[PDB]
Amino acid sequence: AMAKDSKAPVVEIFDERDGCTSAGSTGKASDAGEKGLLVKVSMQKVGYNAIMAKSVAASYMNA
Amino acid sequence: AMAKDSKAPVVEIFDERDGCTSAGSTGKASDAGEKGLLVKVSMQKVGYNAIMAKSVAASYMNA
Amino acid sequence: LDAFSKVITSADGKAAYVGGADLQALKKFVSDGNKRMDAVNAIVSNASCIVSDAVSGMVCENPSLIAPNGGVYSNRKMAACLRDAEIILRYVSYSLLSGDSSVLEDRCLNGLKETYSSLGVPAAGNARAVAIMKATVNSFINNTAQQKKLSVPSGDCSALASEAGGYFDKVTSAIA
Amino acid sequence: LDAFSKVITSADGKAAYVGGADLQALKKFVSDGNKRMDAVNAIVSNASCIVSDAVSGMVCENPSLIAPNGGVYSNRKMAACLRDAEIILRYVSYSLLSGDSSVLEDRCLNGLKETYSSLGVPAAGNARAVAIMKATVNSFINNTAQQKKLSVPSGDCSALASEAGGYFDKVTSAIA
Ligand SMILES: */C=C\C1=C(C)C(=O)N/C1=C\c1[nH]c(/C=C2\N=C(C[C@H]3NC(=O)C(C(*)=C)=C3C)C(C)=C2CCC(=O)O)c(CCC(=O)O)c1C
Ligand SMILES: */C=C\C1=C(C)C(=O)N/C1=C\c1[nH]c(/C=C2\N=C(C[C@H]3NC(=O)C(C(*)=C)=C3C)C(C)=C2CCC(=O)O)c(CCC(=O)O)c1C
Ligand SMILES: *[C@@H](C)[C@H]1/C(=C/c2[nH]c(/C=C3N=C(/C=C4\NC(=O)C(CC)=C4C)C(C)=C\3CCC(=O)O)c(CCC(=O)O)c2C)NC(=O)[C@@H]1C
Ligand SMILES: *[C@@H](C)[C@H]1/C(=C/c2[nH]c(/C=C3N=C(/C=C4\NC(=O)C(CC)=C4C)C(C)=C\3CCC(=O)O)c(CCC(=O)O)c2C)NC(=O)[C@@H]1C
Ligand SMILES: *[C@@H](C)[C@H]1/C(=C/c2[nH]c(/C=C3N=C(/C=C4\NC(=O)C(CC)=C4C)C(C)=C\3CCC(=O)O)c(CCC(=O)O)c2C)NC(=O)[C@@H]1C
Ligand SMILES: *[C@@H](C)[C@H]1/C(=C/c2[nH]c(/C=C3N=C(/C=C4\NC(=O)C(CC)=C4C)C(C)=C\3CCC(=O)O)c(CCC(=O)O)c2C)NC(=O)[C@@H]1C
Ligand SMILES: *[C@H](C)[C@H]1/C(=C/c2[nH]c(/C=C3N=C(/C=C4\NC(=O)C(CC)=C4C)C(C)=C\3CCC(=O)O)c(CCC(=O)O)c2C)NC(=O)[C@@H]1C
Ligand SMILES: *[C@H](C)[C@H]1/C(=C/c2[nH]c(/C=C3N=C(/C=C4\NC(=O)C(CC)=C4C)C(C)=C\3CCC(=O)O)c(CCC(=O)O)c2C)NC(=O)[C@@H]1C
């Protein structure tokens, strides 16, 4: 059966081949043969977004 | 002289008068006389946003 | 494949980081391995756009959903709907990353029709939101959206766009 | 405004939460207290929209900025510019919350012209990004933007809108 924890796989694609790096750019995995490239996946709870909920309610008729 | 830490005051406005609350809706301050209303202010580092930087470079000609 | 299975089963927020030889192997065993990374990015980097536009279009085509006691009347129900749209969108993105829909079907879809039935979540609006996400994802994968663009080497991603559309079709069938 | 000055001076991520009697007092101490809360929300709840549209407009009006050796050439420089635009916008939003510009002037603007001059950050592009943010914020405070709307009690906010524009003018004057 489906989960009930409001969690979904958060996929993040990294392409730093232009050379711009930050602390998170090293140490997370080997880069051998795929310099600058990484796929990150983690399970995160998807929270309510009051600001977006209010915005849709007020703005939905504007494409 | 100006700071150099890339930090800015993050102002958050809360209006939960419709009755929908969450863990963060209590114990942050007394609500005496201003039920469901709160202003929050903190200093936070404004980080680089690679996704938005790439989006603007590719999309800036589209209003 | 075991790296993702570990962090998905634990569901504790620990991340799998796939680079180097692990990444070369990931792409080797799926079709269009590099283009698939771009297609996945085209979805996840636009998640908030996709979700807000789909739920907004669902309501503007059927404003009864936001009338009093409607499906998304009040901020709490609207927020839960936007949350659901993103939950679905992200399981589709993971399906496109992995090349199969098993986690989407097992963790997200299995029993979802019954859950929505009991809650009174209207399946017509639900299907329409999914259909708009499907069409929006299609444009982004093909880089044919009106405003937001993705810069990638020129070529044809029709196959990945069809595969993504098929994962959305699995959602539509589960939503009934 | 001593609670705000505390966490601004400390600049450590500590938050000031203002509710109840403190919030009633804050709203009477500033002018147009309740409208000012709405005007501030019109800025901060649209921060990403405001910043992305202003920097995009700066570039679409001068694409040399994104050519090699231009002010926002490469993702690194474009990202630093988007960062600065949000920094500036957020100090403007805090000025509108508090009803004065002291923190904006002292912590954000003092010496900023010399910083940009030493780096060669182009003043014309910078001024235009600020100008577009000013115009965008003006529409959001007055709820006259074409797509994103704010639902608030009907009334006039032109005093707050003028004040916000004045804070942008101090930015424009500072970066010359
Ligand atoms: C974040 C939004 C988008 C940006 C930025 C961008 O460049 N493209 C964006 C979205 C996008 N939308 C669609 C397709 C549809 N959006 C719909 C909702 C919209 N239409 C309405 O009538 C209302 C209510 C007034 C809305 C909020 C609808 C209905 C569609 C069509 C769905 C369908 O075909 O059945 C796309 C895909 C098409 C395109 O490339 O323009 C994108 C990319
Ligand atoms: C997040 C964006 C917005 C939503 C959603 C919305 O409802 N309004 C939004 C933005 C907004 N922009 C402006 C004004 C300007 N935007 C500009 C940039 C745009 N124009 C271009 O020529 C290009 C490049 C092709 C762009 C990316 C510009 C130049 C302006 C005008 C600035 C000026 O007046 O000097 C506003 C304010 C006007 C309005 O309400 O429409 C908003 C609200
Ligand atoms: C219901 C699910 C709706 C919703 C709520 C929601 N609120 C927050 C976060 C915060 N809410 C407040 C508000 C208050 N805190 C107080 O102490 C008081 C009284 C004085 C109020 C009015 C605050 C301060 C926060 C932030 C908490 C913090 O900074 O630590 C969230 C986010 C999660 C959380 O609980 O922190 C959510 C989801 N959101 C919706 O979309 C529904 C419409
Ligand atoms: C330069 C300022 C540009 C920029 C960089 C930037 N990157 C991140 C975050 C991450 N980058 C990676 C990429 C890798 N990590 C690795 O080990 C490898 C080699 C195999 C790669 C390719 C990852 C995984 C992250 C996320 C880190 C995490 O999961 O914790 C950031 C965010 C801040 C940070 O340092 O984590 C930034 C700012 N961003 C820009 O806008 C510039 C274009
Ligand atoms: C449909 C999605 C669109 C499209 C894509 C397209 N991409 C390529 C080539 C490459 N894409 C990447 C991207 C990545 N590889 C990674 O490992 C990661 C991180 C996880 C990313 C982001 C790479 C490396 C390539 C190879 C070429 C290069 O080095 O840049 C192509 C070219 C064909 C191919 O299969 O290589 C195409 C066509 N193009 C479009 O026009 C669509 C909108
Ligand atoms: C210009 C910004 C626009 C506008 C604003 C406007 N607002 C009100 C009235 C109120 N606004 C609030 C909002 C808050 N108070 C808080 O403490 C918080 C959290 C920090 C918020 C979000 C409140 C409480 C009121 C009072 C009425 C009510 O209870 O709802 C008015 C009415 C006049 C007045 O001064 O009260 C106006 C005009 N209206 C527009 O049309 C502009 C686009
Ligand atoms: C949005 C297009 C539509 C909509 C959505 C809506 N959904 C709910 C409530 C729930 N949604 C789920 C879905 C999941 N939970 C999970 O953990 C997962 C997988 C990881 C999924 C897919 C569940 C379980 C619920 C019930 C529990 C909960 O509220 O979180 C609501 C709230 C319904 C209510 O009346 O309380 C809404 C509004 N509603 C629409 O009208 C759209 C068609
Ligand atoms: C965007 C509209 C324009 C632009 C911006 C840009 N800025 C920098 C570099 C810096 N910006 C600042 C500004 C601040 N730092 C702070 O801490 C604060 C207050 C809290 C402010 C206002 C500083 C100090 C720098 C230098 C240090 C740093 O980079 O962080 C750059 C990078 C310049 C370079 O050549 O490396 C850019 C690109 N550039 C444009 O072209 C637009 C007009």
CATH (domain of D147) = 1.10.490.20
Closest residue by Cα to residue C8 from C81, C96, C86, C108: C108
Residue C149 CB less than 6 A away from ligand 1: no
* Cβ contact, residue pair B29, D17, below 8 Å: yes
Are B7 and B45 spatial neighbours (Cβ–Cβ below 8 Å)?
yes
Residue identified by tokens 């500036």 is: D88
Report the neighbours of D using a cutoff of 3 or more CB pairs below 8 angstroms: A, B
Is there a binding annotation on residue B4? no
Q: Kindly list the distances between the CA atom of residue D81 and the CA atoms of A49, A53, D134, in Å, as whole numbers in the listed order.
A: 27, 29, 16
Q: Kindly list the distances between the CA atom of residue D133 and the CA atoms of D125, D127, D172, in Å, as whole numbers in the listed order.
A: 12, 10, 11
Are A2 and C107 spatial neighbours (Cβ–Cβ below 8 Å)?
yes
Q: Kindly list the distances between the CA atom of residue C105 and the CA atoms of A7, C3, C66, in Å, as whole numbers in the listed order.
A: 14, 19, 29
The Å distance, Cα D132 to ligand 2 centre, comes to: 7
Q: Kindly list the distances between the CA atom of residue D97 and the CA atoms of B34, B41, B44, D34, D160, in Å, as whole numbers in the listed order.
A: 17, 10, 17, 11, 10
Domain count, chain D: 1
The DSSP secondary structure of B11-22, one letter per residue, reads: EEEEE-TTS---
**Does the beta carbon of B38 lie under 8 angstroms from any beta carbon of chain D?**
yes
What amino acid occupies position A49?
N
Instruction: In whole angstroms, give the CA distance from residue D152 to residue D168.
Output: 24
Nearest listed ligand to the Cα of residue D72 = 8
The residues that bridge with C15 in the sheet, in sequence order, are none
Instruction: In whole angstroms, give the CA distance from residue B23 to residue D46.
Output: 24
Instruction: In whole angstroms, give the CA distance from residue D176 to residue D164.
Output: 19
Closest residue by Cα to residue A40 from C22, C135, C143, C128: C22
The DSSP secondary structure of A5-62, one letter per residue, reads: S-EEEEEEEEE-TTS---GGGSSSS--TTSTTEEEEEEEEE----HHHHHHHHHHTT-
Closest residue by Cα to residue D150 from D20, D73, D39: D39
The Å distance, Cα B25 to ligand 3 centre, comes to: 4
The method recorded for this entry reads X-ray
Are A12 and C42 spatial neighbours (Cβ–Cβ below 8 Å)?
no
The residue of chain C nearest to residue A59, with distances taken between CA atoms, is C56
**Does the beta carbon of A32 lie under 8 angstroms from any beta carbon of chain C?**
yes
Closest residue by Cα to residue D95 from D7, D174, D22, D166: D166
- SS3 breakdown of chain B: % helix, strand, coil, rounded to 5? 20, 30, 50
Strands A37-45 and C16-18: antiparallel
The residues that bridge with D17 in the sheet, in sequence order, are B40
Q: Kindly list the distances between the CA atom of residue D122 and the CA atoms of C108, D16, D118, D167, in Å, as whole numbers in the listed order.
A: 50, 36, 11, 21
Are C172 and C105 spatial neighbours (Cβ–Cβ below 8 Å)?
no
Q: With b meaning 16 or more CB within 10 Å and e meaning fewer, what string describes D136-172?
A: bbbebbbbebeebbbebeeeebeebbebbbebbebbb
The residues that bridge with B38 in the sheet, in sequence order, are B14
What amino acid occupies position C71?
G
Closest residue by Cα to residue A40 from C97, C130, C104, C129: C97
Are D130 and D172 spatial neighbours (Cβ–Cβ below 8 Å)?
yes
Nearest atom within ligand 3 for CA of residue A50: 41
This structure's resolution (angstroms)?
A: 1.8
**Ligand 2: which residue has its CA nearest to atom 8?**
D145
Longest alpha-carbon distance in chain A: 50
**Does the beta carbon of B20 lie under 8 angstroms from any beta carbon of chain C?**
yes
The DSSP secondary structure of C42-87, one letter per residue, reads: HHHTTHHHHHHHHHHHHHHH-GGGGSTT-TT-SHHHHHHHHHHHHH
The residues that bridge with D146 in the sheet, in sequence order, are none
Nearest listed ligand to the Cα of residue D74 = 4
The DSSP secondary structure of chain D, one letter per residue, reads: -HHHHHHHHH-SS-EEEE-HHHHHHHHHHSSSHHHHHHHHHHHHTTHHHHHHHHHHHHHHH-GGGGSTTSTT-HHHHHHHHHHHHHHHHHHHHHHHHHT--HHIIIIIITTHHHHHHHHT--HHHHHHHHHHHHHHHHHHHTT--SS------S---HHHHHHHHHHHHHHHHHH-
Q: Where are the domains of chain B?
A: 1-63
**Domain enclosing residue C62, as ranges:** 1-175
Are C145 and C70 spatial neighbours (Cβ–Cβ below 8 Å)?
no
Closest residue by Cα to residue D22 from C123, B37, A45, B25: B37
* Cβ contact, residue pair B11, D24, below 8 Å: no
Residue identified by tokens 């709307």 is: D149
Burial classification of residue C152, based on how many CB atoms lie within 10 Å of its CB (0-12 exposed, 13-18 middle, 19 or more buried): middle
Contacts of residue A26, defined as CB under 8 A and 6 or more positions apart, other chains included, come to none
Are D170 and D91 spatial neighbours (Cβ–Cβ below 8 Å)?
no
Q: With b meaning 16 or more CB within 10 Å and e meaning fewer, what string describes C136-148?
A: bbbbbbbbebeeb
Closest residue by Cα to residue B53 from A20, D134, C166, C74: A20
Instruction: In whole angstroms, give the CA distance from residue C141 to residue C138.
Output: 5
Residue identified by tokens 């679905």 is: C88
Collapsing DSSP to helix, strand or coil, A3 comes out as coil
The residue of chain C nearest to residue B53, with distances taken between CA atoms, is C150
Closest residue by Cα to residue C140 from D46, B51, B50: B51
Rounded to 5 degrees, what angle do the CA atoms C171, A61, C81 make? 35
Instruction: In whole angstroms, give the CA distance from residue C25 to residue C18.
Output: 10
